Structure 1
Amino acid sequence: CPKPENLEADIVIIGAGAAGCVLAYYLTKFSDLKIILLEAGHTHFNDPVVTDPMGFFGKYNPPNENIRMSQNPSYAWQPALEPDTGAYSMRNVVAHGLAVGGSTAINQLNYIVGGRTVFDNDWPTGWKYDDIKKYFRRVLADISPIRDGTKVNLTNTILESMRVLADQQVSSGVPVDFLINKATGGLPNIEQTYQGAPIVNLNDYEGINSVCGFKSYYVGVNQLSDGSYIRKYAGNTYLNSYYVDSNGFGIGKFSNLRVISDAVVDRIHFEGQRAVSVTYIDKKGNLHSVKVHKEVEICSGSFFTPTILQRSGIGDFSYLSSIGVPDLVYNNPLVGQGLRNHYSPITQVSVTGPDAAAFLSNTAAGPTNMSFRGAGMLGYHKLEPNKPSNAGSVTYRKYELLVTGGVAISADQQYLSGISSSTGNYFALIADDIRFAPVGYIKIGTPNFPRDTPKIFFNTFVNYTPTTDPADQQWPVAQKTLAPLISALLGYDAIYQIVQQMKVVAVNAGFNVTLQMAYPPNDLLVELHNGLNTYGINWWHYFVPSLVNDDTPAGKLFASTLSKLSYYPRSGAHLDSHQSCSCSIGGTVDTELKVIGVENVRVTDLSAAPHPPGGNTWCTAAMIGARATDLILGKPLVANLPPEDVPVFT
């Protein structure tokens, strides 16, 4: 049976995403083992729409196919989730990149590293902050992001307003407002606003800043000697022409490395409890089998790691037998469970003034800010019942705030609201959830070949139906069910209570302008503010009006207002693309990242995270891959590599 594609080795890494390349690179650098990478994708080093950062916004799109890279089946997998019973049963498609570099070839390029507190309070032993912060330093040094290269006065006004009201939040003694950081003290952690003001680094090495108002992010772009920016991503850095031949061999130093471009993997041939081989389909349609000697690594992303595991034989035996899996290995009913993701409701602001163009200048997107102009990361609101115990003594990251010019609601909402993108006296504010509550799971549907869409369940904004139970002991399930909608409403109020300090700051900053939230409607926010400050910590009793027993017309007003307000976060919002926690630590893998019930396979992508980090989930996956390098190799080498040693660029 003459197949000369004998690619037997000792380590096989599957999926060259944000974590696959880091591992393959630093694994062939520090040892002599024979390494193989399989990705099922070519290298888009020459594509203008990839390498140019501004191509993300559709600059190179043919006029008849104006879709960008997340909606393009030639660039990204297209999985759709089953009807969201919390969002009027609207199915959604969220992508995972299909190329060297994974989703980093198609993403927005932001570098939130996540707070310090999360890795100290939500991760297992060995994964506390002080065990990994060095790895975060390693990756941010390997990329070297940059800051915004353009000033603007709107950032100054907004930072002014936030410090103004953080002054009061510092007083009044309440301990859990959203602008209090405990690692600084009485002084607010708000960046100064004047020429020669220093810059507060969000991703600081010692994690002092978990709540801070700044002016710019750190995007993963570099400037070339010519004057043009390009994209600096995982495949760009760790796997470029200098390190790997066009035929897939490494060069000299890394001669013990093999990369196959287009090879879709199906499952893991598995003798006993010992993985022994892997098969894949090349671009004819042939099945090639390769031996594994020493270990197998799975870096296939959040959606497609549990899936390949389940086809392999690890999962729920009853289910996999039901749908027709012939070979069964380990009976873990938790594989593909506990899926987590962020979520960002959207609001926009109207400015009334004859010459407000002077106010909104220098807001357009360049390859250094990518339309991001701030503003800060906030903590828990004062009136949110779902806070951990440590909230009295440690500050947690809850909301990530973003400001952007133009309007960003969906087109149907644009038409409905009466405000369009043509006019230029409008801008958008976003209060992202980082601690988003809902949880889902992933189930395969056919044991034949890797399918683009497996069963993915994710219900977010569900409702609570009261029972005949006495009110006293049914409240603490209403709390658990209504957490996310409460969080979104509190984000709305938090953004709302900024615009008045912004009014004052603009008035005495040389601007006769007026600021106002028009989406959601003005009245529907003033009423929420009044209801909050008149009903206190028991404001959220009124989501269910049959239990408050408050038949006063004021109570009916509050119930109706919350009913209407519950509509906006369902439709006028944007599910993010930060999928994580499919095979988390403890649930499916141990703290050394090995799969329970087997001795020589590990999962090391973002699916293995036991909690979503404090922001955009790119650094985290690379950190996990980097740490996996050490755990596989045995001794810390990437650990204290000097920071001046960085991969060369080509």
Structure 2
Amino acid sequence: SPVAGQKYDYILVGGGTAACVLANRLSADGSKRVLVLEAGPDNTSRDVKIPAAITRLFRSPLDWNLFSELQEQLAERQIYMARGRLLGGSSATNATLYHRGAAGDYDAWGVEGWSSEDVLSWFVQAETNADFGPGAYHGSGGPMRVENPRYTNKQLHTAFFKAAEEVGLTPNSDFNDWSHDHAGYGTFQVMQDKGTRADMYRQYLKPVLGRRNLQVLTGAAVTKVNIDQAQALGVEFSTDGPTGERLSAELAPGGEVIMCAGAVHTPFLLKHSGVGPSAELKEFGIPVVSNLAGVGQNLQDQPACLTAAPVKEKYDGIAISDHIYNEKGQIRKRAIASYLLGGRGGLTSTGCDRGAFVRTAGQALPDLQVRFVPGMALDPDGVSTYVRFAKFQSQGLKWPSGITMQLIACRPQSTGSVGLKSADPFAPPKLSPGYLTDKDGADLATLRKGIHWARDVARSSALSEYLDGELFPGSGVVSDDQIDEYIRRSIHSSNAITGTCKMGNAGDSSSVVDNQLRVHGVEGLRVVDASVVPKIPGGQTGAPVVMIAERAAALLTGKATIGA
């Protein structure tokens, strides 16, 4: 009905991070008709604009509310896996940390045309940085906005840095400068524009919505790609949930469907379209169009656990919880004024934007990311404690002042999977993060050693000044076995999720797409989202997604080639 009688040069399945970049670059010259189908609503929420309102976005109507299958290795728990559901996707709901990982992360992909030297100019093209001028590693002029965080906790941020120096870690002045080693302590840059979230809807899509050749539908759930026998024809979707009429948007001759539904929903939708392991499709009576074993395999996510400690009574009130709430759970006037007057102060913080990358045991690249928060977790699950913090508003209670260190396995060895639980394309996917399943126990050892590192930092003179005991994991958790059980019971997502539609070289039979991002065995079908990442880089995954989307757009518009 909104597509009746229309023919599209490009149909984007999803209106998230990658889709926003592609909708912008593909519609640019006026010659191509682009459709974007997003299941979620328009991006208008003030909870998206204000970085600290990340707390409110978890388990909200702007999230998919996904839970994993029971995880026998994690004390028989389902794991919550946050995912954005609105224009901008997970860029509209993420912690805004700007990370590329190390050059060695892209070289480890072993994909022709996607080496560290190949990708660097695509990160640089995307970037405008408030704190780094143009150079080998930074651009000026791209649509992204990156800056140093405009909240600083004067006591606790500097005490973390001095504590890290004291235990023997060195400062890293730029975690995205590939000329120096990734390890070290310091400040994470953020995808913000003077303290407001600079998500890919705001930076790429919203400024071009006036273009005649670009049509964006929200509340549009894709149910499958229509494939002829194997040639993509377009896509089926409902604008009215499960009971809605299945509409079909149709490709023009020479047109392409681009999958932009992310590392959870892209392999889910491929499987519903007959692209996936034939046994999984047959289970639910889906005809096999392309028997690709790797669809939904190779799920990489970075698992987390945390430590937390209160400050001494004399330091009551110095935490970011004290900067955002008064002692009855009212948003502080000073925080609202600082945010509106100059884009500064606690409401500009997602909390976890200072930290470190650490080698626990002489690895080629750091295995551990630490995120320091100048506020105290009240749950060993940091995502649950952010939900608690949002729900705390107006309860008339005082959040106790302290700190948290979140420990992340940033280059994990474990893998999981996404598949089907049902023939219904509106049902949730069958999701397994597979945390701590790697044969050598390397991911558990990383997090155990992370806990030891966080305790070494909290014990240093610099932080000892402020701290008064330890809340998590606490005095009952000391031996290796006690720590390992604490990790099993508290492990949560740091919200990466990549690699479920892996790009590969010629002759890599685990791959779903080639180095041109084309799905094996289907014409006119590509994947441009985190699904394609062969091996997860260290650090958060949003900037690498934007880099892939920029380079894919340059490929599709004929401004660049891949391989030569």
Q: TM-score, normalised by structure 2?
A: 0.82
Contact 2:447 2:487 in 1 (8 A): yes
Instruction: Pick closer, same or farther for the CA change 1:220–1:460 going to 2, 3 Å.
Output: closer
Q: 286, 299, 322: which one pairs with 2:245?
A: 286
Q: 445, 457, 467: which one pairs with 1:498?
A: 457
Take 1:55 and 1:611, find their aligned partners in 2: how far apart are those partners?
Answer: 31
Contact 1:30 1:637 in 2 (8 A): no
- Higher CA-based Rg: 1
Match of 1:170 in 2: none
Take 2:48 and 2:320, find their aligned partners in 1: how far apart are those partners?
Answer: 28
Instruction: Pick closer, same or farther for the CA change 1:519–1:118 going to 2, 3 Å.
Output: same
Contact 1:17 1:299 in 2 (8 A): yes
Contact 1:78 1:453 in 2 (8 A): no
Residue 257 of structure 2 is aligned to residue 296 of structure 1: yes
Take 2:109 and 2:275, find their aligned partners in 1: how far apart are those partners?
Answer: 26
Contact 1:405 1:426 in 2 (8 A): yes
Take 1:269 and 1:410, find their aligned partners in 2: how far apart are those partners?
Answer: 45
Instruction: Pick closer, same or farther for the CA change 1:412–1:495 going to 2, 3 Å.
Output: closer
Take 1:637 and 1:316, find their aligned partners in 2: how far apart are those partners?
Answer: 30
Match of 1:571 in 2: 489
| CA distances 1:540-582 after superposition (whole Å, capped 9, x unpaired) | xxxxxxxxxxxxxxxxxxxxx3322221111233222221110
Q: Aligned runs of 1:8-87 on 2, under 5 Å?
A: 8-30=7-29, 32-45=31-44, 47-57=45-55, 68-72=56-60, 74-87=61-74
Instruction: Pick closer, same or farther for the CA change 1:519–1:99 going to 2, 3 Å.
Output: closer
Match of 1:642 in 2: none
Contact 2:190 2:353 in 1 (8 A): no
Match of 1:110 in 2: 97
Match of 1:489 in 2: 448
Q: 168, 190, 194: which one pairs with 2:171?
A: 190
Instruction: Pick closer, same or farther for the CA change 1:332–1:573 going to 2, 3 Å.
Output: closer
Residue 423 of structure 2 is aligned to residue 447 of structure 1: yes
What amino acid is the match of 2:171?
A: I
What amino acid is the match of 1:319?
A: E
Match of 2:305 in 1: 345
Residue 472 of structure 2 is aligned to residue 519 of structure 1: yes
Paired residue secondary structure (2:104): helix
CA-CA distance at 1:17 after TM superposition: 0.7
Take 2:42 and 2:89, find their aligned partners in 1: how far apart are those partners?
Answer: 11
Structure 2, gaps ≥5 residues long:
129-142, 325-345, 386-391, 505-510
Percent of paired sites with the same residue: 23
Instruction: Pick closer, same or farther for the CA change 1:42–1:6 going to 2, 3 Å.
Output: farther
Instruction: Pick closer, same or farther for the CA change 1:116–1:516 going to 2, 3 Å.
Output: farther
CA-CA distance at 1:297 after TM superposition: 0.6
Count of residue correspondences: 505
Contact 1:115 1:397 in 2 (8 A): no
Q: 185, 191, 196: which one pairs with 1:220?
A: 191
Q: TM-score, normalised by structure 1?
A: 0.71
CA-CA distance at 1:265 after TM superposition: 1.4
Q: 196, 200, 215: which one pairs with 1:234?
A: 200
Take 1:320 and 1:303, find their aligned partners in 2: how far apart are those partners?
Answer: 17
CA-CA distance at 1:113 after TM superposition: 2.1
Match of 1:134 in 2: 121
| CA distances 1:594-620 after superposition (whole Å, capped 9, x unpaired) | 111122211110011001111111111
Q: Aligned runs of 1:363-382 on 2, under 5 Å?
A: 364=323, 366-372=346-352, 374-382=354-362
Q: 151, 154, 164: which one pairs with 1:152?
A: 154
Take 2:278 and 2:320, find their aligned partners in 1: how far apart are those partners?
Answer: 61
Instruction: Pick closer, same or farther for the CA change 1:410–1:10 going to 2, 3 Å.
Output: same
Paired residue secondary structure (2:9): strand
Structure 1, gaps ≥5 residues long:
58-67, 167-178, 180-188, 192-199, 224-228, 463-478, 526-560, 639-650
Take 2:145 and 2:410, find their aligned partners in 1: how far apart are those partners?
Answer: 25
Q: Aligned runs of 1:635-650 on 2, under 5 Å?
A: 635-636=559-560
Match of 1:629 in 2: 553
Instruction: Pick closer, same or farther for the CA change 1:433–1:236 going to 2, 3 Å.
Output: same
Take 1:155 and 1:412, find their aligned partners in 2: how far apart are those partners?
Answer: 22
- Note the aligned Cα RMSD (angstroms): 3.0
Q: Aligned runs of 1:249-260 on 2, under 5 Å?
A: 250=211, 255-260=212-217
Paired residue secondary structure (1:290): strand
Instruction: Pick closer, same or farther for the CA change 1:625–1:359 going to 2, 3 Å.
Output: closer
